[PDB]
Design a protein around this ligand. Structure first.
Ligand SMILES: COc1nc(N)nc2c1ncn2[C@H]1C[C@H](O)[C@@H](COP(=O)(O)O)O1
Ligand SMILES: [Ca+2]
Ligand SMILES: [Ca+2]
Ligand SMILES: [Ca+2]
Ligand SMILES: [Cl-]
Length: 156
């Protein structure tokens, strides 16, 4: 890995359920996921996370918690993906479909992990316990994990 790209990911939760969206185009199309994107020059990471939540789901939030940082290395690439993960326990507005993503609430027992990125099932249990975490995954293509590190932490 020679260079890095910052990315964001936002999970909105309520008691017993999590808001995901079906990615309709682009990177990770066909997978359910949280909302997020890149960080423009002049934005903070949190500002960028809030922007993409609004553009993709129609929602805004007041309190937003930083919960995770996961680095992704894809075999054959020289750019690292540095993903900054946030949780909201409350929201403003009502979710609506965009050209990019279709939001849907899932009960905990219905989260569709076989139709999500392969990493998600491993850190979702930490997220649901209101924990913080650091990780690293090396992927061979989009659906095989070849190396994996993950740890609960106190601070990020
Ligand atoms: C590899 O494993 C991965 N696992 C998970 N859960 N999310 C991942 C991911 N790789 C990228 N992302 C997320 C970050 C962003 O929210 C969005 C891309 O930003 P846009 O292309 O929409 O601008 O996709
Ligand atoms: Ca996006
Ligand atoms: Ca976009
Ligand atoms: Ca956008
Ligand atoms: Cl696209």
């Amino acid at each position: 890995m020679f260079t890095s790209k910052l990315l964001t990911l936002v999970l909105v939760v309520q008691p017993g359920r999590v808001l995901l969206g079906m990615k309709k185009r682009g990177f990770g199309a066909g997978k359910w996921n949280g909302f997020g994107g890149k960080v423009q020059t002049g934005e903070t990471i949190e500002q960028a996370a809030r922007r993409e939540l609004l553009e993709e789901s129609g929602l805004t939030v007041d309190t937003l918690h930083k919960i995770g940082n996961i680095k992704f290395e894809f075999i054959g690439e020289t750019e690292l993906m540095d993903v900054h993960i946030f949780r909201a326990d409350n929201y403003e507005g009502e979710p609506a479909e965009s050209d990019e993503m279709r939001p849907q609430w899932f009960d905990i027992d219905k989260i569709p992990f076989s139709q999500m990125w392969a990493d998600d099932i491993l850190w979702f249990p930490l997220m649901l316990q209101k924990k913080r975490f650091l990780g690293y995954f090396k992927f061979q293509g989009h659906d095989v994990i070849v190396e994996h590190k993950l740890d609960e932490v106190e601070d990020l």
